[PDB]
UniProtKB/Swiss-Prot annotation:
The modification N6-methyllysine is found at K12. It comes from Saccharolobus solfataricus (strain ATCC 35092 / DSM 1617 / JCM 11322 / P2) (Sulfolobus solfataricus). One of its GO terms (molecular function) is double-stranded DNA binding. A highly abundant chromatin protein, it binds double-stranded DNA without sequence specificity; there is approximately 1 Cren7 molecule for 10-12 bp of DNA. Constrains negative DNA supercoils. Induces DNA compaction and mediates intermolecular DNA bridging. Binding does not require protein methylation. Binds single-stranded DNA weakly. Increases DNA stability against thermal denaturation. Promotes formation of loose nucleoprotein structures with long DNA in the presence of albA proteins. Methylated at multiple sites, to varying extents. InterPro entries: Cren7_sf, dsDNA-bd_Cren7. The lineage of its organism: Archaea, Thermoproteota, Thermoprotei, Sulfolobales, Sulfolobaceae. This is Chromatin protein Cren7. It is found in: Chromosome; Cytoplasm.
DNA sequence: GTAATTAC
DNA sequence: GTAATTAC
């Protein structure tokens, strides 16, 4: 639910709340966290790395 | 190559 | 079915 600074497919930076988040690694095993985002301007979906202590 | 996830 | 998301 924490907003994140991401670059959109339109090439603008924005502070968005990811629609869905997860860590890319087996459950309990640690890896990079990824968010699914949606661009308010283009409507396009995109993914972006999340900050490491991001609440999953 | 692949981890997890999913829009397309 | 594929590529997008980073990092190993």
């Amino acid at each position: 639910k924490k907003p994140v600074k991401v670059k959109t497919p339109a090439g603008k930076e924005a502070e968005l709340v990811p629609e869905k988040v997860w860590a890319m690694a087996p459950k309990g095993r640690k890896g990079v966290k990824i968010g699914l985002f949606k661009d308010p301007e283009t409507g396009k979906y995109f993914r972006h790395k999340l900050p490491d202590d991001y609440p999953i």
